[PDB]
């Protein structure tokens, strides 16, 4: 509930694999947010995406709502987010840029899978922190 930083439904326009066999760069425009655009690299053998399909895209922190320092998966029966999402990535917002007055772009790297999210009014929701989950469901 309070851990989702961004949430929108996107209509995919283009899915081009550029010299790739499992990663595509999808282009999607928002629904009812005419200014919000989305460019996203997706593993399409885990989450296949076709041109003109509806994607519910959510950005959240704290997906699950020791000093071992190595990431440990949550328990199998854990009531967490991503139960209702088909594709989840973990990355970091490393760049905020202005594309025009009242319009900014946010850049995420999910281990090299890049996402560029564009919009206007998200200033109290999107930050430059490691905690950023991308949740996509068809």
């Amino acid at each position: 509930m309070s851990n989702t930083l961004f949430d929108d439904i996107f209509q995919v326009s283009e899915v081009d694999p550029g010299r790739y066999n499992k990663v595509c760069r999808i282009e999607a425009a928002s629904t009812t947010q005419d200014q919000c655009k989305l460019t996203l690299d997706i593993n399409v053998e885990l989450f296949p995406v076709a041109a003109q399909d509806s994607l519910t895209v959510t950005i959240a922190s704290s997906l699950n709502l020791s000093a071992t320092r190595s990431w440990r998966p949550p328990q199998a029966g854990d009531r967490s987010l991503a139960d209702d999402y088909d594709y989840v990535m973990y990355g970091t917002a490393y760049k905020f840029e202005e594309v025009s007055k009242d319009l900014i772009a946010v850049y995420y790297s999910f281990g090299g899978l890049l996402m560029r999210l564009e919009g206007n009014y998200r200033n109290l929701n999107n930050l430059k922190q490691e905690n950023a989950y991308l949740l996509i469901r068809r």
């Binding site: 066999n21 949550p74 328990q75 199998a76 854990d78 991503a82």
Partner: protein, 335 residues
């Protein structure tokens, strides 16, 4: 995917296990017997005195490769290690002849010999439990016959060809009794050891000891121990007509058949298939066929050099892997 190795036109995909807890949120596939016990299967396609073909189904690549590696380079076998030349007047050098004798495989059962201790002086190191002595005394003479002039050198000279069968077993000590029912002979008697002319002589004896293929190839007991993943051919959409014949000609002769009546091509025997991915270059079956390999289905082909049966070789490989695991578990861990 999902246990199937992907055979594409330019690359191979999905080649790793992905069967451990931590692959996904469902921390399944954690180790336990009584799951491996019920899953694992062995299917012996054929068994011979020297070649075994068997399937290890639902086992991991690492374990199967461990068995293959142990068979190639860790199952002991008996080979000549030292050759003592009393006389060699042939055109083949002594080192070359010794190497050839060492490469000759001997039909002597391992576990009937004891490992030589290297820490012993050469005059007490070789015992009757450690060593097999093979003698070789061949002399060439002109044949006392009158055949056609300059014929082949078989009726022209006597003992012109030295064969592995000319290696004579020389029992030492108690070997006169233990080896009485199973005299040591080369596994391939007709190996051409040497060719030599009248007046030339080879007189030697060779000491044959247990050894490891990792140390020297002559000790390897398999002429090749190997496996292959079971091929998988998926006909996604029906292929019929002359297209079916074209599709069928892209595989080895008996791989996929043509149905009579329904007229559609069908996969008749994917085990016969060598994965040349010849179908993947034709653009008319690009959307009609998917080539794969079952990742946990191993078709083992073990062919013995001759000393032991291939089933014994494989069982010894499994025993060796288990024994090294056991010995490591029993070893105390040093700081």
């Amino acid at each position: 995917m999902s246990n199937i190795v992907g055979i594409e036109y330019n690359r191979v995909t999905n080649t790793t296990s992905t069967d451990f807890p931590g692959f996904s949120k469902d921390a399944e596939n954690e180790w336990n017997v009584e799951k491996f016990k019920k899953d694992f299967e062995v299917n012996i396609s054929s068994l011979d005195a020297r070649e075994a073909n068997f399937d290890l189904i639902n086992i991991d690549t690492s374990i199967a490769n461990a068995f293959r590696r142990i068979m190639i380079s860790e199952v002991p076998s008996v080979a000549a290690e030292y050759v003592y030349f009393f006389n060699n007047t042939s055109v083949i050098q002594d080192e070359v002849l010794a190497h050839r004798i060492g490469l000759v495989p001997l039909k002597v059962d391992p576990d009937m010999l004891t490992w030589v201790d290297s820490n012993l002086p050469d005059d007490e190191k070789f015992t009757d439990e450690n060593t097999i002595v093979l003698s070789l005394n061949v002399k060439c003479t002109r044949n006392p016959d009158a055949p056609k002039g300059s014929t082949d050198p078989k009726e022209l000279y006597n003992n012109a060809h030295v064969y592995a069968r000319d290696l004579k077993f020389e029992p030492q000590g108690r070997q006169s009794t233990t080896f009485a029912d199973c005299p040591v002979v080369p596994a391939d008697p007709d190996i051409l050891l040497a060719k030599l002319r009248p007046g030339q002589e080879i007189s030697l004896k060779a000491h044959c000891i247990l050894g490891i293929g990792g140390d020297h190839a002559k000790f390897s007991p398999v002429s090749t121990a190997s496996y292959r993943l079971l091929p998988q051919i998926n006909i996604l959409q029906p292929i019929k007509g002359e297209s079916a014949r074209r599709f069928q000609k892209c595989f080895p002769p008996g791989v996929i058949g043509i149905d009579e009546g329904s007229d559609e091509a069908y996969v008749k025997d994917a085990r016969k298939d060598t994965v040349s991915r010849e179908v993947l270059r034709y653009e008319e079956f690009a959307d009609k066929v998917k080539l794969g390999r079952v990742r946990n289905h191993f078709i083992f082909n073990v062919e013995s050099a001759g000393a032991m049966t291939p089933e014994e070789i494989f069982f010894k490989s499994v025993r060796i892997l288990k024994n090294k695991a056991e010995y490591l578990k029993n070893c105390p861990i040093t700081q």
